[PDB]
């Protein structure tokens, strides 16, 4: 069905995601908290292994549960690239204009909050 | 990485002088730099320079010390006046990674504050 | 932010593990590094981070805790490990070191 | 219907404009105004956004008044697209010559003018 | 109809160059002319301008008008990414080897005045 | 059959791994284990091999057996890709804030036990 | 027809030959005779100025003429390629090792002369 | 028949090659035998021409000898990528870890024996 | 960024001597640098390009001379049999792109005079 | 190139415009530079390319023309902003400076 | 590029003396130095590669030490308990990655005896 | 690894080509170079990996040879190239030099 289109799509942004993280130069003399960069880590990390997941999901194809899975996947993929962004974009703005990466924050926010509230609500209905 | 430095031994209350230390084996651009003292074995931190470049300065001396940072000729300085008999210790010039943790220290200097001879 | 230290002389037989402690005052989290000082020189960086071992470093030293009480402990404690140790406070400015407490010896009388 | 390939024309420029702001060197030198990082920073952040919330909403499916904010989307990941390619030359060029950056800018107002009234054609055309 | 493999093509040249701007390293003791970067900047967003227009005018779909005014786009998309080309080439190696800037744009410029020639004669049959 | 999605899937995460791995600074004061370098060597090229491995396979076409090798292949790739972040994160990350490589290493772990634990099952089930 | 994938075929391969060129580390120390260098901008600008031609010219459709040097641009697209692999590992390694581009140089000799062969049989026989 | 897939596939992987060769970074106090930069300019080179002439051929469609050569270009090719990778790799690490290189030449020693074996066979049965 | 200079005060007809400048702020190795002149007028003086070129006002293109260490950060000109007419005051400097110049030294006399 | 000025001492009120113009010789485009000198200290660069002001610069000085004739102008003068202002040809070696001309001001006799 | 090289002339048997030589024109980091002597037959004398490794010839492994000053950008040599057949000139050359050298020196006379 | 020169002066003419050789001792490959001294100055950079001439080197020298022998042969030699020639492998330290022959010339008695 639609897996191979979330598949392809999903490997993508999981492998876009991934050479940002190796295009990041940062310093000893850094002024971003150490929690920002395991955050970082932890969540680069969390989406590669959903799209990952989501990959070895649609490479499988009671059918309901896997379909819902697959789709949740997909979302889950989403919301970790969009928080993946935010990460990105403050620590690379962080080190001139901490009001930069305030905004850029403030301005992803309200996007984060409908897919949340989204997720809540496929994750409710979801046995 | 190697950090040595060599300021003076004895000298009057009230005096002053200007301890430099060489470091050589990494880039002295992009590394935050200390000083940290040790009194004859409380081991107690005394001032930092952020290679902006701003400062800090510990609790006590934030009067009579004052660092500088030459990045091309790659030596850390920190001049000190108005020593009192209670200044007396080795001072190291240490280097920071990211963490406000040292690692590589230096060798020491003895700075004696005294009046005799 | 100021650190305690409970006894100043470990007395400790070799190859047996001892734990010096260190109380932190405030909630200082993980940003705790400990020091190793041979006496007479310039001590050097055991522990970064209240659990990560640095670099050159023997695997004898294990340090652990958070928040406000750490403890670093030596299982296997050699001989020539007869040195000071200081635990610091990574946190915020001033950056203070406790007391130190040196690592003795028990032998014959 | 042309929502799959609007999503696909704006994940294409988002993705451009990721891969431009993440590789663009900075110095704390730089003698633009902290108002153009910030800029910079909300305009690449909001045409993610913006795409992802497209591409989500198109492939998730009053409903008129939903495809015709899917065109929206479309048309405002456009002028994000123009107004980010303004603030980038304008980052990169203003430390060198402050005149390309005007030239520039002065150049691509009527364009966006042209854009801007037809988006408020259709705003107050919207419903 | 052939919209959409424009505005495809289109967008992915224009990003194309735009990249290409990003990954521009000068200095301030340059050879190049300013007007050298003013062209530069000028170029560069009206590439981009005109390759957003074409991309809009495919979403918008007296019809021969609009298709005229299409291919007229497409053709000056083309027309700006090879002189963006030509003054990129120029930029790139102006610092070491003026007759090697000198060399790309007589290289340059029979296909210009091919196009050129034909921009005209589509020009002067629109409308 | 699904050996072609599979196969493009494999090539697609190999070219991120490569792209990634010819991209990374590094620096002879570096503190990570050597057999962090060597496992990081290690991972990418067999990736790599095993993504051409795949397609080779695939395209020059006991029988089932080849196919439930194919289906091996493609899961060990994920899982290598998988891998290959973990230490690419780590290899960028240990001089800054070990912290950061370690709870990036200790939050993958989960998901690697997934993974490790269907593949151990299909190996158990190998014919 | 052919035109299309052959024009496909020319696009990509110019589009490898700029993001090559665009990111070349130069030095005014460097050794190579400024021959090279104005070879090397002749080349690339002339290879993505044949790609353009062709693109245009097979969109934009003594007729059998215009099909032979459809042909002519995609032979002449392949030998520029190659053309620019050789200046480009020349002017890359020839303050390193002259001997590594000499025999680079002298082992793509061979297959240099057999295209241009080819072409040269093509051109005996163009009309 | 499957020739522009082959085409398509050994252009990407060639250009991919040839910017991989576009970044790297050496100097002049380097530890890499002169031979190891002499394969690699011979190697890339090599892959480099071999896809061209693929590319070529392709472009030409008594026959079967055609098809054969079609494919063992296509083979030559993946052999010469292959190798390619190995001397990249090699190149990239020996500067700091001569273990990791040797460690990726013996993890690409028995996919390459394959392939050899695999030419040898098809090139006995090739005429 | 930062620019003292510090040559010398008062000296004799046909004389010679070089004045320095310490530049601490900024890159020196990416920047062209000048030294200018001051009836009150500005006037310009030379211009060092730090490949090295250099370039000389319309009257002076045959005393005066720059030099760029820019391992060491500083601009020194030379300056040979100084005529009465040469007393002002020279302020280092450093060019941006538009041959103008933003970031001034602060100042040096060198009055050239025959009297005590 | 050469560049006149008009007036020397612009016998000006507190804030009111003033217009200091530079008249110069040749055809020199849009590279002119203006600098202001307080006096007793090194010239501070004003406006660059003729048009565009610099980075740390109050708002009031505005500059135009092109080709041969230029002009700055202040509304709303200060007090403090009594100095001296020159302009510079950026166009072609040598960079020559206008004669330069003061900022006056009339007040009681 | 410029290397100019100036050490001492004349010294007495097992005495001691260190060359300097000083380049401008390139990246000294990234450039393995070489001292090579000639009393005209040239031999070489030892290398230092700008970790930082030594070689030495075959005879003064024992009496001979290189040093190279990066941010300095110099390059040393101190030789010890010289013999009188040391007396040579003593050029300091570059090598790029063909142990071959091309931008060597202009020459440093040391004449080791115990006359005067 | 240790370098021979057949003869110390070739004896040549003007304009007529003169052929130095180099017979090495081990099998050095390719990684020879030949340098130019002119009397009384610093030896400058001929060839480099016996094949490759230099930047700034007028193309009548060319050099030959692999493995154990190598040869400088110079067409068309100039009288101003009246020097001597070196030649040192580049293959193993340490870096040694043949015992170098002169370039003379033969003219009348
Ligand atoms: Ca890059």
Same mark, same amino acid.
């Given at each position: 069905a639609k897996?191979?289109?979330?598949?392809?799509?999903? /490997?993508?942004?999981?492998?876009? /995601?991934?050479?940002?993280?190796?295009?990041?130069?940062?310093?000893?003399?850094?002024?971003?908290?150490?929690?920002?960069?395991? /955050?970082?880590?932890?969540?680069?990390?969390?989406?590669?292994?959903?799209?990952?997941?989501?990959?070895?999901?649609?490479?499988?194809?009671?059918?309901?549960?896997?379909?819902? /899975?697959?789709?949740?996947?997909?979302?889950?993929?989403?919301?970790?690239?969009?928080?993946?962004?935010?990460?990105?974009?403050?620590?690379?703005?962080?080190?001139?204009?901490?009001?930069?990466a305030w905004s850029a924050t403030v301005v992803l926010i309200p996007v984060m909050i409908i897919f949340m509230a989204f997720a809540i609500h496929f994750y409710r209905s979801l046995v | 990485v190697q950090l040595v430095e060599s300021g003076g031994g004895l000298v009057q209350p009230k005096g002053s002088l200007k301890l430099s230390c060489a470091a050589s084996?990494?880039?002295?651009?992009?590394?935050?730099?200390?000083?940290?003292?040790?009194?004859?074995?409380?081991?107690?931190?005394?001032?930092?320079?952020?290679?902006?470049? *701003?400062?800090?300065?510990?609790?006590?001396?934030?009067?009579?010390?004052?660092?500088?940072?030459?990045?091309?000729?790659?030596?850390?300085?920190?001049?000190?006046?108005?020593?009192?008999?209670?200044?007396? *210790?080795?001072?190291y010039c240490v280097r920071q990674k990211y963490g406000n943790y040292f690692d590589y220290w230096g060798q020491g200097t003895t700075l004696t504050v005294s009046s005799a001879k | 932010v100021v650190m305690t230290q409970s006894q100043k002389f470990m007395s400790t037989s070799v190859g047996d593990r001892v734990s010096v402690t260190c109380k932190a005052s405030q909630n200082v989290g993980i940003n705790v590094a400990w020091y190793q000082q041979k006496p007479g020189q310039s001590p050097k960086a055991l522990i970064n981070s209240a659990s990560y071992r640095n670099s050159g470093?023997?695997?004898?030293?294990?340090? =652990?805790?958070? =928040?406000?009480?750490?403890? #670093?402990?030596?299982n296997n404690v050699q001989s020539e490990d007869l040195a000071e140790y200081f635990c610091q406070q990574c946190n915020s400015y001033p950056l203070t070191?406790?007391?130190?407490?040196? #690592?003795?010896?028990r032998r014959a009388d």
């Open positions: 897996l191979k289109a979330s598949s392809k799509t999903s /490997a993508l942004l999981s492998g876009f /995601a991934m050479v940002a993280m190796v295009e990041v130069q940062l310093d000893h003399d850094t002024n971003v908290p150490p929690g920002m960069l395991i /955050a970082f880590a932890i969540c680069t990390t969390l989406l590669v292994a959903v799209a990952m997941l989501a990959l070895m999901i649609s490479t499988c194809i009671l059918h309901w549960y896997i379909e819902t /899975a697959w789709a949740f996947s997909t979302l889950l993929g989403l919301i970790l690239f969009l928080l993946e962004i935010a990460i990105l974009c403050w620590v690379k703005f962080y080190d001139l204009s901490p009001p930069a | 084996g990494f880039t002295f651009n992009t590394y935050a730099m200390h000083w940290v003292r040790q009194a004859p074995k409380g081991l107690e931190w005394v001032a930092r320079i952020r290679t902006n470049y *701003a400062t800090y300065y510990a609790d006590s001396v934030k009067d009579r010390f004052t660092i500088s940072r030459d990045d091309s000729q790659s030596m850390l300085y920190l001049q000190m006046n108005n020593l009192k008999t209670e200044d007396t *210790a080795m001072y | 470093v023997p695997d004898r030293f294990t340090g =652990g805790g958070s =928040g406000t009480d750490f403890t #670093l402990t030596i070191f406790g007391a130190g407490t040196k #690592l003795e010896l």
